[PDB]
C-alpha cells in the first residue's frame, strides 16, 4: 500500500556491536553505536480486532539460535513458519496498510540516514546495589565521628506516619 | 370486576366471609401454564463423525477429548464457568479438612 500521513511501519531487532567516533562537516565529533541486523524476519501478524482492536501487530524475530534448546511449542511454531528459531521476538504496533507477509526478511536499509529512531533494550544489571549507587543518595561524613554509617540511607520516613510509603527508595536489584 | 391481586399467577384467589362473620374463607385453585405460553423442546441430533471408510473409527474418536491445566488457568476457568471468585478453589489445610463433620445430621 502507499504511505498515508497517519501510518506506522514495522521496526526490527538488531545487535549492539559497539561504539565508534564520527565527525561532521563542521568538525564536530559525535559518538555512534553500531547495530547489526543478523537474521531479522517477520514471524506472525495478528489482525486489528484479534489483539485489542486498537492497532494491528507484527511480531519480529531476532538472531538465530539452536533448535536443541527451545520449547517444543516454539519448535513447532518455527517448523510451521519454515525458519530458524529466534533469540527474541518483539511486537510492533502498525496500521493495517503496513502489514507484511510472515517470514519476510528485514534489512538495515529499512532505515535511512537522516531519521530518528527509538532503541529499547535491557540495561546492564548491577545486582543488589546500595542506595548510594542505586539512587545517587549522599552518604554520611567519613571521619568526623561516624559509627558504621557511611553509606546508609539514613531516615526512611517520619514518625507520625508510622510506616514506609510504597514509593520509597531503598537498596535493591538494579 | 375487582380483584386485590392479579389472578394470572400461582393462584385464583377469592376471599369470602361467612354469614356469622367469624371466619374468613380463602379459595385458591392453581393456575395451569397454558399451551400457548410454552415453546417446544429442541431435539439436537449432531452426527458428523461418520467417514466413508470405517465405522469404529468414530468409536475410537469418541475418546479423543482430554485436557490438563495447571492451578492458575484451571482456577480461572472454574471461576469464569461458575461466576465465582478465585478463592473458592484453592485448597485448605489439614486442620480445617479434618475438623469438618463427615456424618452431619440429616433432616427429612
Amino acid at each position: 500500500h502507499p504511505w498515508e500521513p497517519g501510518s506506522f511501519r514495522v521496526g526490527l531487532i538488531a545487535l549492539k556491536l559497539g561504539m565508534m567516533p564520527l565527525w561532521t562537516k563542521d568538525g564536530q565529533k559525535h559518538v555512534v553505536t553500531l547495530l547489526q541486523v543478523q537474521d531479522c524476519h517477520v514471524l506472525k501478524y495478528t489482525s486489528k480486532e484479534n489483539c485489542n482492536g486498537k492497532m494491528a501487530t507484527l511480531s519480529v524475530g531476532g538472531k538465530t539460535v539452536s533448535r536443541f534448546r527451545k520449547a517444543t511449542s516454539i519448535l513447532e511454531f518455527y517448523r510451521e513458519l519454515g525458519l530458524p528459531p529466534k533469540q527474541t521476538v518483539k511486537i510492533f504496533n502498525i496500521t493495517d496498510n503496513a502489514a507484511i507477509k510472515p517470514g519476510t526478511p528485514l534489512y538495515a536499509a529499512h532505515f535511512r540516514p537522516g531519521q530518528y529512531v527509538d532503541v529499547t533494550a535491557k540495561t546492564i544489571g548491577k545486582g543488589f546495589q546500595g542506595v548510594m549507587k542505586r539512587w545517587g543518595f549522599k552518604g554520611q561524613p567519613a571521619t568526623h565521628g561516624q559509627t558504621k554509617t557511611h553509606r546508609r540511607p539514613g531516615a526512611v520516613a517520619t514518625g507520625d506516619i508510622g510506616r514506609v510509603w510504597p514509593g520509597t527508595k531503598m537498596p535493591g536489584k538494579m | 370486576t375487582y380483584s386485590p391481586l392479579p389472578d394470572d399467577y400461582n393462584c385464583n384467589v377469592e376471599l369470602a366471609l361467612t354469614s356469622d362473620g367469624r371466619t374468613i374463607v380463602c379459595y385458591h385453585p392453581s393456575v395451569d401454564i397454558p399451551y400457548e405460553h410454552t415453546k417446544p423442546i429442541p431435539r439436537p441430533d449432531p452426527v458428523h463423525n461418520n467417514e466413508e471408510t470405517h465405522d469404529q473409527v468414530l468409536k475410537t474418536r469418541l475418546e479423543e477429548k482430554v485436557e490438563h491445566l495447571e492451578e492458575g488457568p484451571m482456577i480461572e476457568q472454574l471461576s469464569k464457568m461458575f461466576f465465582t471468585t478465585k478463592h473458592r478453589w484453592y485448597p485448605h489445610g489439614r486442620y480445617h479438612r479434618c475438623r469438618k463433620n463427615l456424618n452431619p445430621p440429616k433432616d427429612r
Binding site: 510509603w165 510504597p166 514509593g167 | 471461576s79 461466576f83 465465582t84 471468585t85
Partner: protein
C-alpha cells in the same frame, strides 16, 4: 408437584438472570434493585449462608441520568499507595473515562461489606449500550421495570393530548414574544 427431592432442591435454589435497563435512570435507584437481587433479598428462602444470589444484567449504563448537579458536584476519590497518589475526579470525568464505573461503584457501595461482595459482583454484568452477548441474552429472564418515569419531552405528545390540555391565558394580540 411431588417433585423428587433433588429436582425440587434444584428448582428451589436455581439462579435467575434479570435484565435491567439504564437509559435515563438514576444510578442509585438502579443499584438498589441490583443489590437486592444480587444478595437474594427478593426470595422468601433467603439466608446469608444459602448463597441464593441471582444474576443482574444492566444495559445502557452509559445513558444513566443524575438528578440535580451531581454530574459536576459528585467526586469519586481514590488513592494510589504512593505519595502524591490522591486522585479526585467528578462524575462527568469518571463517566467519560469508563461508561460502567458509576453504576458499578453504586452497586459495590450498597452491597454488604463482607467477603460475599466480590462473588455478588461477579454475578453482575454491565454494558454501556444496547449490545449484549448472545449467551447472556439467551440466559435473560424477567426484565425488571424501570424506576424512573421518563418525563416525556414536548415533541412526543400526541396532539390529541395538546387539544385536551387547556389554554391558561389569552395573550395580547399586539405582542411580539
Amino acid at each position: 408437584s411431588s417433585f423428587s427431592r433433588a429436582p425440587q432442591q434444584w428448582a428451589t435454589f436455581a439462579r435467575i438472570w434479570y435484565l435491567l435497563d439504564g437509559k435515563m435512570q438514576p444510578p442509585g435507584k438502579l443499584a438498589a434493585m441490583a443489590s437486592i437481587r444480587l444478595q437474594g433479598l427478593h426470595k422468601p428462602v433467603y439466608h446469608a449462608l444459602s448463597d441464593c444470589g441471582d444474576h443482574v444484567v444492566i444495559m445502557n449504563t452509559r445513558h444513566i441520568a443524575f438528578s440535580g448537579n451531581k454530574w459536576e458536584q459528585k467526586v469519586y476519590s481514590s488513592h494510589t499507595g504512593y505519595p502524591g497518589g490522591f486522585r479526585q475526579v467528578t462524575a462527568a470525568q469518571l463517566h467519560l473515562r469508563d461508561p460502567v464505573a458509576i453504576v458499578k461503584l453504586a452497586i459495590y457501595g450498597m452491597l454488604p461489606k463482607n467477603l460475599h461482595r466480590r462473588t455478588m459482583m461477579e454475578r453482575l454484568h454491565l454494558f454501556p449500550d444496547e449490545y449484549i452477548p448472545e449467551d447472556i441474552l439467551k440466559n435473560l429472564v424477567e426484565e425488571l421495570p424501570q424506576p424512573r418515569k421518563i418525563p416525556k419531552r414536548l415533541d412526543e405528545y400526541t396532539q390529541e393530548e395538546i387539544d385536551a390540555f387547556p389554554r391558561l391565558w389569552t395573550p395580547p394580540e399586539d405582542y411580539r414574544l
